[PDB]
Amino acid sequence: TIPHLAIDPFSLDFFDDPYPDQQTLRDAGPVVYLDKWNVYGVARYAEVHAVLNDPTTFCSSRGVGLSDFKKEKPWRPPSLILEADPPAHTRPRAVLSKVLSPATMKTIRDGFAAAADAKVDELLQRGCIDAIADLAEAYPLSVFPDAMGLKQEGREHLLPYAGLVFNAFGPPNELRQTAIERSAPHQAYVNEQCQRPNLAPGGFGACIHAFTDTGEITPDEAPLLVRSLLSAGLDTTVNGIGAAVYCLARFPGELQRLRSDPTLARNAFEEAVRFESPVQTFFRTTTREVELGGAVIGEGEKVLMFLGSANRDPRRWSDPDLYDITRKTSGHVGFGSGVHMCVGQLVARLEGEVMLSALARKVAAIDIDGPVKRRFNNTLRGLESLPVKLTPA
Ligand code: HEM
Ligand SMILES: C=Cc1ccc(C(=O)O)cc1
Ligand SMILES: [Cl-]
């Protein structure tokens, strides 16, 4: 039998401090029923990993938010990659894989790193900064829109559109309906920049459109794949870099280990993705009746996966609530797992690595010197404001 819990994983009280409720969710059983929203939940590593790696049974084509696309209309045309199953998913995935490939990383790495060093040097001249606005947001804003090949005007829509996208995966609570109500201008901007004429040659966007003659995608599919990168590519890395700086501020012994070996930067960022998990929850929909962890779940049922909880499950991790930059992180689900595992993870890791590398070489300490403010979102975890003082090395 399935235990029934009344915990609302989309409530502000839950966002404010999710870990006690996540333990309650893990320890209640491998599968729980959340009466507040009539969905099944899995919060342990083993079950989250199993659901992610069974796309036939736990599909994405009926949406990865609460809404079931077989019952309700999506709020925007479905993503051709995130909200598709194999085999429809395979070829657009292949394209984005080759757009966001190792060879692409080689062409952008020097410029991404130069931009990270310049930013830290500029922030060190200020001393007292907001690590969100002035670093976690400013740095990805200074590299990603240009890497995409976006024009300069209208970029103020990028972060609002992303927050709308991740809020829309949630239930129809105030967070979701508020975001959708104010969505029209951001939707208009993003959709217009997805068209080939508006994307600079050499960028990720033009590269997607240039892939439309191999037989893997058609020209009418390319704008939606550009839309995918502009939905998923910015706010996630913003919260990821914010997580990393927040972690280095709360664990000064780890900042000091990072300083002494800056080659730890890539794993320091990976551990921050596990520790804070910028993408906290995602849904699947069962395509049949299925046994999961000794539990039978009917067909057509939504299953809420707790990625951040799987990443703190003491059944899988030693000392899961410690930030440890030399941890063996392989297997964490902060980027997902299986056929949909984050196709932009090389970009994310590049941004985070070069930013933590710059801090490792230029910063002696990071001290919180003001009120920390949390940013609330139905799917994303991160901070609104992180007042810090940077001490130059
Ligand atoms: C720290 C940063 C990031 C995190 C935590 C993150 C998280 C995730 C997760 C958990 C998934 C799996 C979704 C699912 O299984 O339903 C995913 C997929 C995806 N991500 Fe990321 N992501 C990050 C950065 C990026 C970047 C930088 C890009 C693009 C430049 C990107 C684009 C995508 C896309 C297009 C998908 C769909 C993949 C598919 O369905 O095959 N993400 N991301
Ligand atoms: C992991 C978040 C995510 C959001 C949007 C999309 C998309 O729009 O395809 C993909 C991934
Ligand atoms: Cl849209």
PDB file of all heavy atoms in Angstrom, residues 75-77 161 164-165 186-188 190-191 227 231, ligand 3:
ATOM      1  N   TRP A  75       0.483  25.153 -22.270  1.00  0.00           N
ATOM      2  CA  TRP A  75       0.401  26.610 -22.305  1.00  0.00           C
ATOM      3  C   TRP A  75       1.148  27.208 -23.492  1.00  0.00           C
ATOM      4  O   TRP A  75       0.912  28.372 -23.838  1.00  0.00           O
ATOM      5  CB  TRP A  75       0.925  27.200 -20.995  1.00  0.00           C
ATOM      6  CG  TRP A  75       2.407  27.077 -20.813  1.00  0.00           C
ATOM      7  CD1 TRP A  75       3.084  26.004 -20.319  1.00  0.00           C
ATOM      8  CD2 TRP A  75       3.395  28.078 -21.109  1.00  0.00           C
ATOM      9  NE1 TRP A  75       4.442  26.268 -20.297  1.00  0.00           N
ATOM     10  CE2 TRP A  75       4.655  27.537 -20.773  1.00  0.00           C
ATOM     11  CE3 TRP A  75       3.337  29.376 -21.632  1.00  0.00           C
ATOM     12  CZ2 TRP A  75       5.845  28.246 -20.942  1.00  0.00           C
ATOM     13  CZ3 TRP A  75       4.521  30.081 -21.800  1.00  0.00           C
ATOM     14  CH2 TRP A  75       5.755  29.514 -21.459  1.00  0.00           C
ATOM     15  N   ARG A  76       2.048  26.448 -24.099  1.00  0.00           N
ATOM     16  CA  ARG A  76       2.786  26.782 -25.308  1.00  0.00           C
ATOM     17  C   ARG A  76       2.957  25.488 -26.084  1.00  0.00           C
ATOM     18  O   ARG A  76       2.842  24.400 -25.511  1.00  0.00           O
ATOM     19  CB  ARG A  76       4.167  27.395 -25.016  1.00  0.00           C
ATOM     20  CG  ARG A  76       5.095  26.463 -24.248  1.00  0.00           C
ATOM     21  CD  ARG A  76       6.536  26.948 -24.212  1.00  0.00           C
ATOM     22  NE  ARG A  76       7.377  25.961 -23.551  1.00  0.00           N
ATOM     23  CZ  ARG A  76       8.704  26.043 -23.439  1.00  0.00           C
ATOM     24  NH1 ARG A  76       9.369  27.070 -23.957  1.00  0.00           N
ATOM     25  NH2 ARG A  76       9.366  25.081 -22.811  1.00  0.00           N
ATOM     26  N   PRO A  77       3.228  25.570 -27.388  1.00  0.00           N
ATOM     27  CA  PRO A  77       3.503  24.358 -28.160  1.00  0.00           C
ATOM     28  C   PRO A  77       4.546  23.509 -27.463  1.00  0.00           C
ATOM     29  O   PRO A  77       5.549  24.043 -26.966  1.00  0.00           O
ATOM     30  CB  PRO A  77       4.026  24.909 -29.495  1.00  0.00           C
ATOM     31  CG  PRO A  77       3.288  26.205 -29.639  1.00  0.00           C
ATOM     32  CD  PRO A  77       3.222  26.772 -28.242  1.00  0.00           C
ATOM     33  N   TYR A 161      11.237  35.034 -19.064  1.00  0.00           N
ATOM     34  CA  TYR A 161      10.666  33.919 -19.815  1.00  0.00           C
ATOM     35  C   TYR A 161      11.061  32.581 -19.201  1.00  0.00           C
ATOM     36  O   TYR A 161      10.228  31.671 -19.076  1.00  0.00           O
ATOM     37  CB  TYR A 161      11.103  33.990 -21.286  1.00  0.00           C
ATOM     38  CG  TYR A 161      10.505  32.894 -22.147  1.00  0.00           C
ATOM     39  CD1 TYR A 161       9.235  33.023 -22.694  1.00  0.00           C
ATOM     40  CD2 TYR A 161      11.206  31.717 -22.389  1.00  0.00           C
ATOM     41  CE1 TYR A 161       8.679  32.006 -23.474  1.00  0.00           C
ATOM     42  CE2 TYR A 161      10.665  30.700 -23.155  1.00  0.00           C
ATOM     43  CZ  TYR A 161       9.400  30.847 -23.698  1.00  0.00           C
ATOM     44  OH  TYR A 161       8.873  29.825 -24.470  1.00  0.00           O
ATOM     45  N   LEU A 164       9.060  31.913 -16.057  1.00  0.00           N
ATOM     46  CA  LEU A 164       7.737  31.493 -16.486  1.00  0.00           C
ATOM     47  C   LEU A 164       7.731  30.019 -16.883  1.00  0.00           C
ATOM     48  O   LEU A 164       6.854  29.259 -16.462  1.00  0.00           O
ATOM     49  CB  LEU A 164       7.285  32.380 -17.645  1.00  0.00           C
ATOM     50  CG  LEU A 164       6.248  31.781 -18.596  1.00  0.00           C
ATOM     51  CD1 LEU A 164       4.869  31.732 -17.939  1.00  0.00           C
ATOM     52  CD2 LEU A 164       6.221  32.573 -19.900  1.00  0.00           C
ATOM     53  N   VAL A 165       8.715  29.595 -17.685  1.00  0.00           N
ATOM     54  CA  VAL A 165       8.774  28.200 -18.145  1.00  0.00           C
ATOM     55  C   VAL A 165       8.826  27.239 -16.956  1.00  0.00           C
ATOM     56  O   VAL A 165       8.080  26.254 -16.893  1.00  0.00           O
ATOM     57  CB  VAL A 165       9.975  27.998 -19.091  1.00  0.00           C
ATOM     58  CG1 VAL A 165      10.293  26.520 -19.254  1.00  0.00           C
ATOM     59  CG2 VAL A 165       9.693  28.642 -20.458  1.00  0.00           C
ATOM     60  N   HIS A 186       7.110  38.384 -23.111  1.00  0.00           N
ATOM     61  CA  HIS A 186       8.291  37.526 -23.145  1.00  0.00           C
ATOM     62  C   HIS A 186       8.144  36.421 -24.180  1.00  0.00           C
ATOM     63  O   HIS A 186       9.110  36.093 -24.881  1.00  0.00           O
ATOM     64  CB  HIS A 186       8.545  36.933 -21.767  1.00  0.00           C
ATOM     65  CG  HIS A 186       8.409  37.928 -20.665  1.00  0.00           C
ATOM     66  ND1 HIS A 186       9.121  39.106 -20.648  1.00  0.00           N
ATOM     67  CD2 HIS A 186       7.656  37.923 -19.541  1.00  0.00           C
ATOM     68  CE1 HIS A 186       8.806  39.790 -19.562  1.00  0.00           C
ATOM     69  NE2 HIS A 186       7.922  39.093 -18.872  1.00  0.00           N
ATOM     70  N   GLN A 187       6.950  35.829 -24.282  1.00  0.00           N
ATOM     71  CA  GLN A 187       6.704  34.848 -25.333  1.00  0.00           C
ATOM     72  C   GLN A 187       6.931  35.446 -26.714  1.00  0.00           C
ATOM     73  O   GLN A 187       7.496  34.788 -27.598  1.00  0.00           O
ATOM     74  CB  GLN A 187       5.282  34.312 -25.234  1.00  0.00           C
ATOM     75  CG  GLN A 187       4.990  33.484 -24.006  1.00  0.00           C
ATOM     76  CD  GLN A 187       3.625  32.832 -24.091  1.00  0.00           C
ATOM     77  OE1 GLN A 187       3.438  31.836 -24.796  1.00  0.00           O
ATOM     78  NE2 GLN A 187       2.654  33.405 -23.384  1.00  0.00           N
ATOM     79  N   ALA A 188       6.472  36.687 -26.926  1.00  0.00           N
ATOM     80  CA  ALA A 188       6.603  37.316 -28.235  1.00  0.00           C
ATOM     81  C   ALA A 188       8.066  37.522 -28.589  1.00  0.00           C
ATOM     82  O   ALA A 188       8.500  37.208 -29.703  1.00  0.00           O
ATOM     83  CB  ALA A 188       5.857  38.653 -28.256  1.00  0.00           C
ATOM     84  N   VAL A 190      10.837  35.934 -27.335  1.00  0.00           N
ATOM     85  CA  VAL A 190      11.556  34.679 -27.531  1.00  0.00           C
ATOM     86  C   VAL A 190      11.197  34.063 -28.883  1.00  0.00           C
ATOM     87  O   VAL A 190      12.073  33.691 -29.675  1.00  0.00           O
ATOM     88  CB  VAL A 190      11.274  33.716 -26.360  1.00  0.00           C
ATOM     89  CG1 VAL A 190      11.814  32.318 -26.656  1.00  0.00           C
ATOM     90  CG2 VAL A 190      11.874  34.259 -25.066  1.00  0.00           C
ATOM     91  N   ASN A 191       9.902  33.989 -29.191  1.00  0.00           N
ATOM     92  CA  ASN A 191       9.508  33.353 -30.441  1.00  0.00           C
ATOM     93  C   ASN A 191      10.107  34.075 -31.643  1.00  0.00           C
ATOM     94  O   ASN A 191      10.576  33.429 -32.587  1.00  0.00           O
ATOM     95  CB  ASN A 191       7.981  33.261 -30.510  1.00  0.00           C
ATOM     96  CG  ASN A 191       7.422  32.275 -29.479  1.00  0.00           C
ATOM     97  OD1 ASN A 191       8.104  31.331 -29.096  1.00  0.00           O
ATOM     98  ND2 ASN A 191       6.195  32.500 -29.021  1.00  0.00           N
ATOM     99  N   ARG A 227      14.088  27.638 -29.219  1.00  0.00           N
ATOM    100  CA  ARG A 227      13.293  27.973 -28.040  1.00  0.00           C
ATOM    101  C   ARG A 227      13.702  27.135 -26.833  1.00  0.00           C
ATOM    102  O   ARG A 227      13.746  27.638 -25.703  1.00  0.00           O
ATOM    103  CB  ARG A 227      11.801  27.795 -28.349  1.00  0.00           C
ATOM    104  CG  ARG A 227      10.880  28.564 -27.415  1.00  0.00           C
ATOM    105  CD  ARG A 227       9.447  28.023 -27.478  1.00  0.00           C
ATOM    106  NE  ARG A 227       9.398  26.615 -27.105  1.00  0.00           N
ATOM    107  CZ  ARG A 227       8.301  25.876 -27.090  1.00  0.00           C
ATOM    108  NH1 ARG A 227       7.141  26.410 -27.463  1.00  0.00           N
ATOM    109  NH2 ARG A 227       8.373  24.603 -26.716  1.00  0.00           N
ATOM    110  N   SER A 231      14.910  28.514 -23.273  1.00  0.00           N
ATOM    111  CA  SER A 231      14.090  28.213 -22.105  1.00  0.00           C
ATOM    112  C   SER A 231      14.941  27.645 -20.984  1.00  0.00           C
ATOM    113  O   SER A 231      14.776  28.015 -19.815  1.00  0.00           O
ATOM    114  CB  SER A 231      12.982  27.217 -22.463  1.00  0.00           C
ATOM    115  OG  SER A 231      12.184  27.659 -23.565  1.00  0.00           O
TER     116      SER A 231
HETATM  117 CL    CL B   3       6.687  30.527 -25.925  1.00  0.00          CL
END
